[PDB]
């Protein structure tokens, strides 16, 4: 149960990277 | 004025040697001044080492770096590396020192009175950084000079007394080299060797035949390319790929010295042919190999069968095997089974170390050579306390291998920083945003958004 718990958290942090980059809030100028 | 303040030159005082990028005269006086400063230390440090020198002690117990450079060339040393005459060391120190004044005489002249410009004083010495032909000829000029200096080393080896050769039979001694190796399959066979364990790239050279023969290929290559770059001008593909500016050329040389800096570090640490162990001391792998043989001799004298001695790990206590099957020493020194030394090779056979010759053919000179190298392993503190980090104060010793490796790694890294600084800069100066982004023409504002 431990090994599944560590890799599951690791996978969420990697999935969090994909959204924080390609689905960020666009910075716009004015 | 004369570009000696920030208002006129644009550079501050902490970057003011850059006020000479287009002052060929004052810049000529700066290099020859710095050239005389090296020649000065070359002679002033050698006479200091000779003054503090003692023949009875080994050179590595006295903190010398250049006397071994003179001794390796065969000047002043006899059989076994023993010093027989200190007069050659004295001449090298004085001639390098007396010569320090003449360049210092001209380096000060070309910098204080000499024409701050030479383009109107002489068409031959005046140059333009953008002049691709004038630059390749100065490169070709100095190539021939360095090519001649390469043939000076072999001139010493083949015609003027020879070189000290640690691999000489029956003990180290100076020997005239009569058959320099010129085979390109061997000389250029070094450049393609892996730089990993067991291979060593060009650090693996282990005979003065290959050292001498390699230096004469370099001698002519620098003469051929020297004449080549005098009679040629860079092709089309060479002009659209490089930056042609005064600082860009400096950055190309910084990255070249950095590479040569790291190469020399691994040389003195691993190589024991051109850096003899009788002068600089045993290497890292050498001294660790010497400890394994020191205790083989001791325990075998008392009745131990070293061949069948099983250590606690299951591997041999004194002898084991390399991953390819060669019989090597046991312990932590298994990593150093690639070491080759004249005090150990007599016991090496077709399949590694020979157990029979170990029982019968070990000589008392090998027992002292192994003990001496064991007690002079390149380990020491910054305040020069010999031994491991937990040793107590007594033996004043760190190996010249340590001073030479650590110092020339610090420089090689800092020059790699110098390349990165000056090379990325010459790019930004050749473009021309090296001082900031233009406000009314900021490039990023004209580009599409990323999202």
């Amino acid at each position: 149960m431990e090994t599944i718990t560590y890799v599951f958290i690791f996978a969420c942090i990697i999935a969090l990277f994909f959204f924080a980059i390609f689905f960020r809030e666009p910075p716009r100028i004015t | 004025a004369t570009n000696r303040d920030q208002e006129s030159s644009g550079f501050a005082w902490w970057a003011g040697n850059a006020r000479l990028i287009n002052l060929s005269g004052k810049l000529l006086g700066a290099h020859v001044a710095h050239a005389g400063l090296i020649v000065f230390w070359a002679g002033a440090m050698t006479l200091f080492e000779l003054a503090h020198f003692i023949p009875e002690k080994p050179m590595y117990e006295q903190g010398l770096i250049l006397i071994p450079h003179i001794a390796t060339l065969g000047w002043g040393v006899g059989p076994g590396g023993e010093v027989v005459d200190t007069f050659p060391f004295f001449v090298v120190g004085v001639v390098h020192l007396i010569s320090s004044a003449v360049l210092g005489f001209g380096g000060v002249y070309h910098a204080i009175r000499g024409p701050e410009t030479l383009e109107e004083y002489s068409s031959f010495f005046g140059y333009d950084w953008k002049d691709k032909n004038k630059m390749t000829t100065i490169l070709g000029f100095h190539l021939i000079v360095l090519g001649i200096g390469a043939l000076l080393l072999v001139a010493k080896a083949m015609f003027f007394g020879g070189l000290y050769d640690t691999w000489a039979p029956g003990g180290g001694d100076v020997r005239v080299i009569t058959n320099p190796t010129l085979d390109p399959r061997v000389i250029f066979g070094y450049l393609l060797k892996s730089p990993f364990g067991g291979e060593g790239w060009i650090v693996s050279v282990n005979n003065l035949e290959d050292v001498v023969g390699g230096h004469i290929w370099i001698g002519l290559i620098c003469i051929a390319g020297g004449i080549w770059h005098i009679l040629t001008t860079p092709f089309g593909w060479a002009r659209r790929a490089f930056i042609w500016s005064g600082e860009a050329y400096l950055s190309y040389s910084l990255g070249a010295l950095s590479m040569m800096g790291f190469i020399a570090t691994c040389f003195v640490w691993f190589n024991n042919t051109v850096y003899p162990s009788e002068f600089y001391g045993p290497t890292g792998p050498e001294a660790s190999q010497a400890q394994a043989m020191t205790f083989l001799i001791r325990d075998q004298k008392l009745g131990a069968n070293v061949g069948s001695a099983q250590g606690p790990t299951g591997l041999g206590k004194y002898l084991m095997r390399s991953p390819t099957g060669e019989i090597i020493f046991g312990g932590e020194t298994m990593r150093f089974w690639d070491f080759r030394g004249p005090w150990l090779e007599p016991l090496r056979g077709p399949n590694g170390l020979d157990l029979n010759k170990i029982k019968n053919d070990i000589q008392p000179w090998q027992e002292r050579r192994a003990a001496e190298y064991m007690t002079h392993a390149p380990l020491g503190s910054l305040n020069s306390v010999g031994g491991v980090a937990t040793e107590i104060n007594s033996v004043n010793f760190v190996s010249p291998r340590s001073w030479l490796a650590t110092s020339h790694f610090v420089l090689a890294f800092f020059f790699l920083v110098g390349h990165l600084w000056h090379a990325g800069r010459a790019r930004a100066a050749a473009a021309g945003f090296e001082k900031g982004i233009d406000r009314e023409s900021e490039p990023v504002l004209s580009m599409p958004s990323l999202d």
Partner: protein, 62 residues
């Protein structure tokens, strides 16, 4: 020859020490670039003579 050496070598150092301070001061000085020039031909031309004698006369005291 015997002592005509520690006098010539000590005179070599004394001349070397006065120029090293004397040459560069003469160097950036527009006091007398012709008056202050021939003492540089003399000293340097004499400096070469003093190193040439101390060198070849060396061999009689070595």
């Amino acid at each position: 020859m015997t002592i005509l050496f520690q006098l010539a070598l000590a005179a070599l150092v004394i001349l070397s020490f006065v120029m090293v301070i004397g040459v560069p001061v003469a160097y950036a000085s527009p006091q007398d670039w012709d008056r202050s020039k021939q003492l540089i031909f003399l000293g340097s031309g004499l400096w070469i003579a003093l190193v040439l004698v101390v060198g070849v006369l060396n061999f009689f005291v070595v």
